[PDB]
Amino acid sequence: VSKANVPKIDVSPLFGDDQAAKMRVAQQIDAASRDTGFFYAVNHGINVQRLSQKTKEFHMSITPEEKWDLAIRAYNKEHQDQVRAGYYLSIPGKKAVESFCYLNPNFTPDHPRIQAKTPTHEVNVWPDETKHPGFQDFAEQYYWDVFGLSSALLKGYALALGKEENFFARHFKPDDTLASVVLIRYPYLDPYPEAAIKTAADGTKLSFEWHEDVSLITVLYQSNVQNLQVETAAGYQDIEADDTGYLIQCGSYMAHLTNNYYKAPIHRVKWVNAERQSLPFFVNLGYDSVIDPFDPREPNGKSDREPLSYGDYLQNGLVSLINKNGQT
Ligand SMILES: CC(C)[C@@H](NC(=O)[C@H](CS)NC(=O)CCC[C@H](N)C(=O)O)C(=O)O
Ligand SMILES: [Fe+3]
């Protein structure tokens, strides 16, 4: 197995007002998006030390009673409104991974998409504050911290594609974004149940099979345990870990709108018997957000692809990913 070229890109100019410096970042984003599809965003300004600590505290202290109380509909039939947000239970002996997903904190009973019962919109569920002191505050502030980073990254992608810097970010708004955070725990287990391990066609032992991300882009923090592989024409290649940077990749919505100029990289999660964290932020737009496709390889830049409403794209993609790679 070879190693993927995953460049470290100093993204800090994307927060600034040096427009030529932004273009140099954009070129690096362009080059990485045309190569393996992944890059590490460094000099990002987010305190990832606190993120990994608050996450470990929550995963290690939440009780089986609380997990049922917060469980999504897939694990608790009483919670029919929890399709996306809530706790995703492990199944000892069968499924090792467990996780907690939350959405836009502005999704409240006051929000018109909640009032309208629009799919993919939900009010977050939270554990008891006294049992998990500071957790909800930490989680909500992290959502907006990574929202700010993601907004800047979207400026880099827009410039990289020859557009004005707000081409994507104008659709990425705190009042309506369908973006989600998932706090994933991959446990150490002795013995590790083979029923929780999948075998790839090439024989690799996996925790999660190949897929493209359902997102515009995905902004991922992981603890320092190598596990990810990206597919290339020459086969799967290891993505090296980096527990200070954010692993950035395009989702299938970006592949659609760029006429596959920026592919959504196919990737998978190797089985590793080690305690670790995987904290993705899925950069999703608004339910009615529509981006007109274009082709940066055509002289006229014209694409025949249909503009896709993001909400319908998200609803179809999340169900499809569950059908193909299992309920997480
Ligand atoms: C590849 C990693 C990001 C991670 N996998 C994942 O997060 C996988 C594949 S991208 N993602 C999903 O299943 C979709 C979660 C969507 C979320 N519940 C929501 O409603 O928005 C892993 O470490 O397993
Ligand atoms: Fe993924």
Q: What is the CA radius of gyration of the chain?
A: 19
Tracing tokens 């939270």 back to the chain, one arrives at 126
Alpha-carbon span 154 to 166, nearest angstrom: 8
Known catalytic membership, residue 213: yes
DSSP single-letter state for residue 95: B
Task: Report the length, in residues, of the chain.
Answer: 328
202: CATH: 2.60.120.330
Inside any domain, residue 1 = no
Among 95, 107, 180, 182, name the best residue to mutate to test ligand 1's pocket (greatest count of ligand atoms within 8 A of Cβ).
182
Inside any domain, residue 2 = no
User: Which among 177, 211, 230 has a CA at the least distance from the CA of 39?
Assistant: 230
Contacts of 62 (CB under 8 A, 6+ apart): 87, 127, 132
Tracing tokens 């299992």 back to the chain, one arrives at 326
Inside any domain, residue 3 = no
Neighbouring C-beta atoms of residue 45, cutoff 10 Å: 11
How do 198-199 and 205-211 pair as beta strands?
antiparallel
Known catalytic membership, residue 243: no
Method used to solve the structure: X-ray
Inside any domain, residue 67 = yes
In angstroms, what is the span from residue 241 Cα to ligand 2's centroid?
Answer: 15
In contact, 236 and 36? CB cutoff 8 Å: no
In contact, 283 and 310? CB cutoff 8 Å: no
In angstroms, what is the span from residue 249 Cα to ligand 1's centroid?
Answer: 13
Catalytic residue among 79, 145, 267, 282: 267
What are 44's two structure tokens?
Answer: 């990002």
Residue whose Cα lies nearest atom 22 of ligand 1: it is 278
DSSP single-letter state for residue 58: H
Pocket of ligand 1 (CB under 6 A): 84, 101, 180, 182, 184, 208, 211, 213, 220, 269, 278, 280, 282, 318, 321, 328
**What is the total count of domains within the chain?**
1
Catalytic residue among 15, 35, 111, 211: 211
Inside any domain, residue 308 = yes
User: Which among 307, 181, 326 has a CA at the least distance from the CA of 268?
Assistant: 326
Known catalytic membership, residue 267: yes
Which ligand approaches the C-alpha of residue 278 most closely?
Answer: 1
Residue span of the structural domain in which 132 resides:
8-325
Known catalytic membership, residue 17: no
